[PDB]
A = this chain, B = another copy of it.
Amino acid sequence: VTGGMASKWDQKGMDIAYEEAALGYKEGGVPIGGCLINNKDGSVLGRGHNMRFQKGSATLHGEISTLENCGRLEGKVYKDTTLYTTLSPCDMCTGAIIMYGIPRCVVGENVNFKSKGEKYLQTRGHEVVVVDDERCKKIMKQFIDERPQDWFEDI
């Protein structure tokens, strides 16, 4: 575990992110999932997965889909949340975290994918905890085993 320490809702958050990745996988998309949790009370504001294949979407990464599914929120709500993602965030999803002032991002794995985003979050004073979750590494591997041209065309 790099980038910080686990906190009390991190098992719940990563479990939901993984469930969303597994749902996306079963739909025929890239298994990338997320959810946004209130750090105070553990409430789930929203959950989502990557909709690139499901909707032919350029922008609906797992983190963007998760934020879309939370709906419109007052800016102050995002300030004590953690965004859970099964996969290290790209520059756009990094940008979402910074723009909304989401203080903390918990990342399943950064072996299959890492951008300059991960470092940039730390440059901008955000917390990025990489938990190296084997369940996230395994489902991404099953997608890449089946659909390497879909994966390497995306990244």
Contacts and interface: CB of A to CB of B under 8 A. Distances in A.
Nearest to A70: B58
Nearest to A152: B75
A74 interface: yes
B56 A71 contact: yes
Interface in A54-77: 56-60, 64, 67-68, 70-75
A153 interface: yes
A98 interface: yes
A56 B59 CA distance: 16
A68 B58 contact: yes
Question: Which secondary structure characterizes the binding site on chain A?
Answer: helix
Given A91-B98, A91-B99, A115-B99, A57 B68 contact: yes
A117 B96 contact: no
A58 B73 contact: yes
A111 interface: no
A116 B100 CA distance: 13
A153 B76 CA distance: 9
A152 B117 CA distance: 25
A139 interface: no
The residue in A57, A60, A68 that gathers the most chain B C-beta atoms within 10 A of its C-beta is A68
A81 interface: no
Interface of A: 52, 56-60, 64, 67-68, 70-75, 90-96, 98-100, 115-117, 124, 152-153, 155
Given A59-B59, A92-B95, A99-B115, 5 more contacts: A52-B72, A56-B71, A58-B71, A60-B68, A75-B153
